Design a protein around this nucleic acid. Sequence first.
DNA 1: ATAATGACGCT
DNA 2: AGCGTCAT
Length: 430
Amino acid sequence: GPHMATGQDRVVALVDMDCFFVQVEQRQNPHLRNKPCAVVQYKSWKGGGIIAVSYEARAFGVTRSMWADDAKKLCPDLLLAQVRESRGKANLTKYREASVEVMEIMSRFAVIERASIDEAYVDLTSAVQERLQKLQGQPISADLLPSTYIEGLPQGPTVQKEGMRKQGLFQWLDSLQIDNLTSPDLQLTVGAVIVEEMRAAIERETGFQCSAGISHNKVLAKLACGLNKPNRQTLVSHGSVPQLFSQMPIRKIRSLGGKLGASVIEILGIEYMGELTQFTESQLQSHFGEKNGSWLYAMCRGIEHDPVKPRQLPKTIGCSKNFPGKTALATREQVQWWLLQLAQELEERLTKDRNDNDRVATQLVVSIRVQGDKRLSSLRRCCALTRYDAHKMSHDAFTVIKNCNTSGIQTEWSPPLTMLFLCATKFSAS
DNA sequence: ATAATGACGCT
DNA sequence: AGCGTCAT
Ligand SMILES: Nc1nc2c(ncn2[C@H]2C[C@H](O)[C@@H](COP(=O)(O)NP(=O)(O)OP(=O)(O)O)O2)c(=O)[nH]1
Ligand SMILES: [Mg+2]
Ligand SMILES: [Mg+2]
């Protein structure tokens, strides 16, 4: 109608590093480049757990969380890089540092929200606005968009992928309304031009390739990112949403991958995101709550308002290690020693954070899991973090959890702990 | 024995 | 405060 908002107010990108840990190891070791390759944690149990996979290895069926011994059965030529181990635990510093390389480059173009170690959202709205004045209503050349797919195009009236890519791009650019500096489709297009530029800059300055989604919000941007991978970017326009959503499994949409997604499917008897449009906002709210219902009602029409938060730095700093199976910690001395290994890594990172980013954590969260409980955390307790000292932090953590030891003999520890987790939080400016 | 983290909602 | 969800 004449008053309906169409969720076309922003230009948002989601940039995701293609098999990131593998790229970091391949940059460092040229012998691993353009080879079936994976990154592995902990060599000893079944060759190690695989945590990142090159696209050459994926084609053999190698996946994350697969044991390396098992992936070698699928892919005998598979090359492996091992994650650094410090103080008896996986240490991800190399990938954190590579990540900062990428996020600093992206920060030159626009406002970014760090989403994970290898993903960031980009609010390109302002950047596009200014680019559109620089562009005298000039046509946008296909040459400015050499790795961009236009989702849903080509339509109607070739046999190779790049064939199809440029046909869709041509149909899109031929149709564009470049006189109108307010057309959402033009804005997205200009957004796509800037993300090409950002991705060229990242590759030139780090050697890392990545993929991107460009759309009007974060959920659509994230979804778009995954449509054409690797080293490609996808524009998802508002107009493309009805066809895209009509066969889009509900669980593919960000935040609908877990329990809420499954109950949407089971309570409503539907499979695809677009089927949600039949329901009133009140019906949706009555099944899933006021906030979830409102969000679904707007999302299945391609509309979502979660802002890109200007936050390039993590809000918590944490250290964690699982002790599965027979390795579960069963004695007081073990528990203490590992709390100390965690606290030491933590102090390193905290101190580094206090020098690099001018801030100071003030609360220490202590999380454990007990044997048999399959919840992530069996128990969470906090205490003050007054001093970046590894021995104080570990002793404090021991203190606030020790009474979970139900054992009679207190040389031993029951029930066995299957996880330790130290998280520094509640940062103050320093 | 699908890790090591991280952000946020509910009460 | 502490637990639950969702995610890479
Ligand atoms: N230990 C562990 N690390 C993981 C896992 N999954 C991801 N990581 C670590 C390692 C990853 O390199 C990195 C990024 O995660 P993604 O973006 O979800 N996948 P990637 O970047 O590998 O490939 P692409 O994006 O092209 O699909 O975070 C896992 O299951 N376990
Ligand atoms: Mg990635
Ligand atoms: Mg990612």
